[PDB]
Design a protein around this ligand. Structure first.
Ligand SMILES: [Ca+2]
Ligand SMILES: [Ca+2]
Ligand SMILES: [Co+2]
Ligand SMILES: [Co+2]
Ligand SMILES: [Co+2]
Ligand SMILES: [Co+2]
Ligand SMILES: [Co+2]
Ligand SMILES: [Co+2]
Lengths: 253, 253, 253, 253, 253, 253
């Protein structure tokens, strides 16, 4: 078997990828999302009740479908990153990255020694298909994609330094965390926050990195796509389930 | 503690109850549905991948919310009915009921001896809260609600006989199974099928039983409500999740 | 490896075995019960929310301890009996047995062809330790113990016929089901029910079969032990957990 | 989306398919087996500790790989067959089929009304991908494959009658059950049993049905393949795991 | 919907709340405890085999009952605190707190930016009921309760400094960890330890914070209640289950 | 009950113990491995998808068998070490230990106060069998075994200092991590790596510590055993499952 090609990583340079957030924390729900045709699915290990074992079930569900899986760990924890790579997550989204030093550690966390610090256990890993990918330890690094989130004042204070880190493939803006950090908690739509988001996207792309964001607001998501943003998540499974059920009940009250 | 009052059962005689089908087969998804404000939630043990233990998890999730739980077992199996009653399901929907003899057996299956055949194990049952409901064995039968499905030609051939069974609280029409049985599989909206459904609702209510149905078609659901139908399910969680995600992607293709 | 000796089965002829009912439906809770020193533990697949997979977890927990496991299936279902034997349950308690014909079918359900109808799949079974017990198919039948419950008027109407069935090792009286069947639901302590229970124990033992019963009432359990009853369950984990927590709170209200 | 093509079913007429028995009862273990390249994988719901939910996890794991899934239910139970078809199993292996009447019921159990009795719930089914396969109710029946086991004296007594059932795609011989039924329990390799197995394969193929069998004995498996047997399982995951670990330890004792 | 009111937090100033430790690590066992009538239940993520997903199941079980849930994480880990708040734990008990600097970080860990560092993901959170609590991001902080444990010499060495931290609602004394730290492991009942515990309760209350403790010793628990201690846990589910089963067996040996 | 004797720990001084790596992450698979007769089984929480709860299930499965369990946590995390000790793991293997300061912290992490920092919660712990081991807090420390991995250049740079740490019972060499660290990723069999491994084994034993290693290469494993290596793992369950299934298929292609 040849290593699974990371099409998400390649497409950061060739197209704009439409994403769906997956926080229903279940292999069955992840498969429903996988049937829709999103370019990427974000399995959320930060804000949904997921662990390594439930994330594995969802990677297994999604794997039969063309949608590319991206996993968000609860934090930039090196041993947790090791665990998510070995169950076969090829793209990671690291929340709350705030310095070039932290970004560089996340780069090393995703790469094998001697250049990085990813723990080596290919005999046990779904990532290598238990060494059925015979050259995995030589071909693994090439298909791993590292995305970091800028979503705090400290992240914005270190943006230019993070953008000079080789191995950071993309910077994703978190509007909820960022609007809260800016003293506009629950009000990311305010011009003060949106002007910072637009300037941040423009700086990310000017440094030759992919820019990403999540917005469930169709107008904002379309504006971000018009600006060239490479990976845009346009909704959240929990939100869509709740709103679809509420909108239906409202027709009958 | 006093036995949990079956408000669904009482409301069969006082109002029209709006329902949501729950087939995501998970305590977390069932809780999301429980927050919307449906009069009843149908935990589907027939057409969703559920078992006694996953149904228990969903009963526990939903129990904090006013929505009334209704459980559909995979068939009219007396021992499975016993298991679902003991985990605390107070309303059952029995699929593919086809004779007064089968309906009478379902009545007995839901009632304690000596009048019925429900196995007695109150020390172990969530239904009795492990005997924290001190008079459960005296008060249980009063709060159990039995619904049977008519959804085959043989069911229609025995409709008047089923409607004379004391202990059948409601008859629910299954349009998918019924349209297939009539040789209109996938086409319940045909006049041939709909004229039979309307006639059947009228006969159910004329016999003093509650009538029920599911339709994700807003026009048909509203027509059934205009006809007086007492318990109408107006959508399905799996369907709403898939459609909401597809409609969103179509805005960005 | 030699087949696991069924000490419960041997001890039916040599001592009085004290039992604990296990309805907490969990490997962790079953292990806590296994540490106490009961002669037998009843994993309840009838009145607790158990399935083949949760019963397996509990057999695995209990297996490190001297307590003998007895499993109760939800009914006398031949294919379910096959499944419980292959995960390694060596003693079964069949609820609501009502005829010698049904008892004879339960005997055959527990024995390999050609004499019985137990499905053969030793390569897959924990019972054979996946054929690490090399002579399992020759030694299995000898260590299987069949217990049947008499707990209805029909069971009492067929008691002498059930007691003449070769392969029925023990008859267990269910006081909850039996008192309900007799029109004394929730009142097994009444003399009318107790006189029938005592006569039934005396007839079971006179026919050379082991007699069994459950009572959480210490006086009744001691009376049953004085009468020679071979397997007496003296309490229920769910009941003891609830009562211990209530009694403690009552000291502080 | 078009309905998943059942390549196993097509290949019954064009090649000899090599199978692996999957009884480790786990999505992770099923994926390991799926990477090897077997033509078919048998998810065993009869002799491994599986239920609808664990079988679903395994179908989801295997679905990313070319290996075709076949599911064996615990018995020819119509409602369980409905549940396994809805989670998306397209090929079923029914144990212990013993009459043309039972084989005909299994045919109807796998087909929609009005010609069959498969319950209709496409909105909830992974089989229809929750109606994302838009024409599922018209295209489903064509891709369902029914295999029945002949593995008892009564099955052999009804072989010619079972072989005349339209809709039975294959007859699979169970050597463990059959050798036990014949009074050679644990000794299927005896000439008395093997002559019956060879004669039975010849009759199945002479009637234009596919013949199948399991043997972990390489010589017997190769003999069955030389006889033209269409679907041959050549080993069992639990057996291979145990033997590989024992053989390794024996090098070091 | 309005944010769930934290009655435990309010009652720290108005009454003495009686608690039960929940370490059976299971939604079913947590529900049994929830039925008893304790003022609070401690879901132990430090000393029972719990994770975010098993804690969620227990929050869902308990939520239908008046008992207030308190969750203990395995350590004062900021990302784990984020995960437990989002699944809807409103009161946290942080073990082994040893400085005002660590206590201040735990305060920030429980509050949204810009004043704290709690990660913002309300669309995904049971805490916000997936934004069905429409003003959650404005109302959340008010209903969060932070308890810290003093249970080491370093904790006692920083007691006055911890008691001056605004946002620490209560200090809980851990007698097991504290007696071990003092060189009296397994002997918290010694006067040397008890004089320190009483002095510590007095200092906690003198500083205007709530004092808490666990003791399964009825005399010590009543003494702590006489001293004004605001939140007293009086037993442990695992302990009560084991002791109740052992006491029963001892009546029959 | 007396504390479970750690025979693995004792045998470090009296014999050479043969090990199997257990990464199938499942109680059922761990039991299969436990039946084979390995001296020790390594439950891998670093490179297999395990968490505290799945490791508990595996300890419960294995506990009925003489094979000694060793658990590898994902990293030398003090709170995770506490959790693994409380579920009853008596031998820990800490990956990537790189200093005497880190080794000394791991020693303290495994011992109760006042000499160590292991959190005290014996009422809740399987380790104490919920205090059914009445003297657990006095007898626990004696039966705990600490193994640390040297598998990086920094570990080799601190080998003599790690070997002087009292409480380190064994040093285990990780050939995958070490060969990668040395710039021979995937090529541990190179003489440059093997000469370092042999020298490292000789130094470990010269300091009076137990030496350990994993190799699935029979020749290398036998060489390490001839050198006196005290604990040698000779294979991996995931590898043996994959290779056994591939080797079988290759006989039939
Ligand atoms: Ca199950
Ligand atoms: Ca978990
Ligand atoms: Co964020
Ligand atoms: Co239907
Ligand atoms: Co009974
Ligand atoms: Co068979
Ligand atoms: Co403590
Ligand atoms: Co390593």
């Amino acid at each position: 078997m040849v290593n699974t090609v990371n099409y998400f990583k390649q497409k950061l340079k060739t197209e704009q990828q439409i994403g769906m957030w997956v926080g229903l924390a279940d292999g069955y729900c992840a498969e429903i999302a996988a049937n829709v045709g999103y370019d990427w699915l974000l399995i959320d290990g930060e804000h949904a009740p997921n662990d390594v074992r439930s994330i594995l079930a969802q990677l297994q569900s999604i794997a039969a479908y063309p949608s590319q899986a991206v996993v968000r760990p609860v934090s930039g924890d090196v041993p947790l990153i090791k665990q998510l790579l070995d169950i076969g997550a090829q793209t990671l989204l690291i929340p709350m990255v705030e310095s070039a030093e932290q970004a560089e550690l996340m780069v090393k966390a995703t790469r094998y020694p001697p250049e990085g610090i990813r723990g080596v256990g290919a005999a046990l890993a779904r990532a290598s298909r238990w060494n059925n990918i015979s050259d995995y330890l030589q071909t693994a690094d090439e298909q791993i994609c590292l995305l970091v989130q800028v979503e705090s004042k400290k992240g914005l204070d270190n943006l230019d330094e993070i953008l000079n880190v080789d191995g950071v493939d993309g910077i994703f803006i978190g509007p909820a965390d960022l609007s809260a950090a800016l003293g506009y908690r629950g009000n990311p739509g305010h011009e003060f926050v949106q002007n910072i988001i637009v300037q941040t996207i423009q700086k990310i792309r000017a440094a030759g990195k992919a820019a990403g964001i999540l917005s469930a607001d169709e107008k904002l998501a379309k504006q971000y796509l018009e600006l060239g943003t490479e990976f845009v998540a346009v909704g959240v499974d929990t939100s869509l389930l709740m709103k679809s059920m509420k909108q239906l009940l409202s027709k009958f009250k």
